[PDB]
Design a protein around this ligand. Structure first.
Ligand SMILES: [Ca+2]
Ligand SMILES: [Ca+2]
Ligand SMILES: [Ca+2]
Length: 252
């Protein structure tokens, strides 16, 4: 099956910049996950043919939010994790299929100067525990903007970002704990040493052209699905957001 994950930096914004409906037709993926939709109700017309669509909205307007587009209807859809403090921002959607869970996550940002790192650490613990509960039942495919560049190879300038959101020791260690719990970073499984492979760049003039980026978008799979990974990629040519889509071809 073919899966795509994309932080769109606002569904209304992405759709003003690129033909999103045409993009979905072109790629013809089985599942497409979006992060940072920044919508409520009742704000945009996104009823594409060929897809069952599931939306998770934040209580605060023009902020966060996620969506999952699926060709096949899932057995169940679960919104959030069942903890009030972690379910106010439309960040998590889990789809249950016969043999696998497919989930999307838009991880809370630690904010400038790591001022909200304490919440990010509590979020990482709560989400990992939830994912582990799913994994005890069926293998898990997680995708999304995890707001972390795991290793020094995951960003252009690691030495200028040790104390910045997305590259603190605390965020890097939380991603390590996630993999150590029995999970695989699909892109790194296919390309363990590949440098310069990024999914986000500043919008600042020249930054993307010069590839000054970070890899903060992932497809993380249960270790048992490792052998099922056909391909993992970063669609750097796709314009419309500050991030580009990430993709996974997996047999399940
Ligand atoms: Ca954004
Ligand atoms: Ca069966
Ligand atoms: Ca190097």
């Amino acid at each position: 099956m073919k899966l795509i994950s994309w932080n769109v930096n606002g569904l209304r914004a992405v759709m003003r910049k690129m033909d999103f409906l045409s993009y979905l037709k072109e790629e013809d993926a089985d599942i497409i996950c979006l992060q940072e939709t920044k919508i409520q109700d009742g704000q945009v017309d996104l009823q594409p043919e060929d897809y069952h669509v599931y939306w998770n909205y934040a209580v605060k307007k023009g902020y966060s939010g996620t969506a999952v587009f699926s060709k096949q209807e899932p057995l169940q859809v679960i919104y959030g994790i069942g903890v009030e403090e972690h379910d106010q921002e439309g960040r998590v959607i889990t789809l249950e299929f016969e043999n696998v869970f497919v989930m999307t996550v838009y991880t809370p940002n630690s904010r400038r100067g790591l001022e909200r790192i304490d919440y990010r650490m509590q979020w990482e613990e709560a989400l990992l525990s939830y994912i582990l509960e799913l994994d005890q039942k069926k293998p898990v495919i997680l995708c999304g903007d995890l707001n972390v560049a795991h290793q020094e190879i995951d960003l252009k300038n690691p030495k200028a970002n040790r104390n910045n959101a997305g590259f603190s020791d605390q965020e890097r260690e939380a991603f390590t704990r996630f993999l150590e719990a029995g999970f695989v970073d699909s892109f790194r499984h296919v390309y363990p040493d590949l440098e310069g492979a990024y999914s986000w760049w500043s919008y600042r003039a020249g930054a993307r052209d010069r590839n000054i980026g970070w890899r903060i978008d992932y497809f993380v799979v249960s270790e048992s699905l490792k052998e099922q990974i056909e391909d993992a990629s970063i669609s750097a040519d796709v314009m419309g957001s500050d991030h580009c889509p990430v993709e996974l071809i997996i047999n399940i």
